[PDB]
Amino acid sequence: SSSVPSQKTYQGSYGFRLGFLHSGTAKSVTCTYSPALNKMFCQLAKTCPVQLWVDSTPPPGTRVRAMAIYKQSQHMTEVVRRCPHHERCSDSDGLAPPQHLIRVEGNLRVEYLDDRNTFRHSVVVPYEPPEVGSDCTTIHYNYMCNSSCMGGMNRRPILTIITLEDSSGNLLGRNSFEVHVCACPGRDRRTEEENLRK
Ligand SMILES: [Zn+2]
Ligand SMILES: [Zn+2]
């Protein structure tokens, strides 16, 4: 059949897992995470904090990669990409190729990959140990297209897969979370958690 990027949780030797801010569901929130759904709700192009927690520190040369896949089997082989409309947005970023859905902000060492063999997009930064006074490292992602964009995800659910890898790309750890990009993430989180209850 067709191999797809794995989404299996794997903490690895460093005890790698993800954390998310406790941001609430008010109308004004821009990024919010549901532990009931393991799902991030966030606004187009806004900052999405993703914490990296480890029990011990990965070595220099370790990198952290992010890639989106469609959640549903019948769409899983389709590369997740930004819609043609959003490709044309004007911003201060001088690094991300216009087709990439996921960007990293605030990191001058970011690299973007358009895999020559799988065609998948990903965004990768060097792993760094927590800043002074912090217990975790955070990476700040932006999602550059809405769930609703007809020329992109077109309402199909996606997951983001975060991989910890060595300098050669070998697996050191993996986690994932669903993400819904939308104008009203607090309202959407509230709706979906209410659906879940029912
Ligand atoms: Zn625009
Ligand atoms: Zn779009």
Residue numbers in the entry: 94 to 291
Show me the paper's own sentences about this structure.
Significant variability, however, is observed in flexible regions such as the DNA-binding loop L1, which exhibits different conformations between the free and DNA-bound p53. A new conformational variant is observed here in the L2 loop of one of the two R273H crystal structures, referred to as R273H (form II) in Tables 1 and 3. The major changes are shown by the backbone conformation of residues 182–187 next to the H1 helix. The interface between the two molecules is further stabilized by the side chain of H178 from one molecule positioned in a pocket created by three amino acids (H115, Y126 and P128) from the second molecule and hence interferes with DNA binding. In this manner, a continuous chain of p53 molecules linked by zinc atoms is formed in the crystal via the crystallographic 61 axis. Furthermore, the conformational changes in L2 as a result of the non-physiological Zn coordination disrupt the salt bridges between R175 and D184 that have been shown by most structures including R273H (form I) and by the previously reported structures of the wild-type (wt) core domain. In the conformational variant displayed by R273H (form II), R175 is engaged in water-mediated hydrogen bonds with C182, D184 and R196.
This in turn initiates a cascade of signal transduction pathways leading to different cellular responses including cell-cycle arrest and apoptosis that are known to prevent cancer development (1–4). p53 binds as a tetramer to specific response elements consisting mainly of two decameric half-sites separated by a variable number of base pairs.
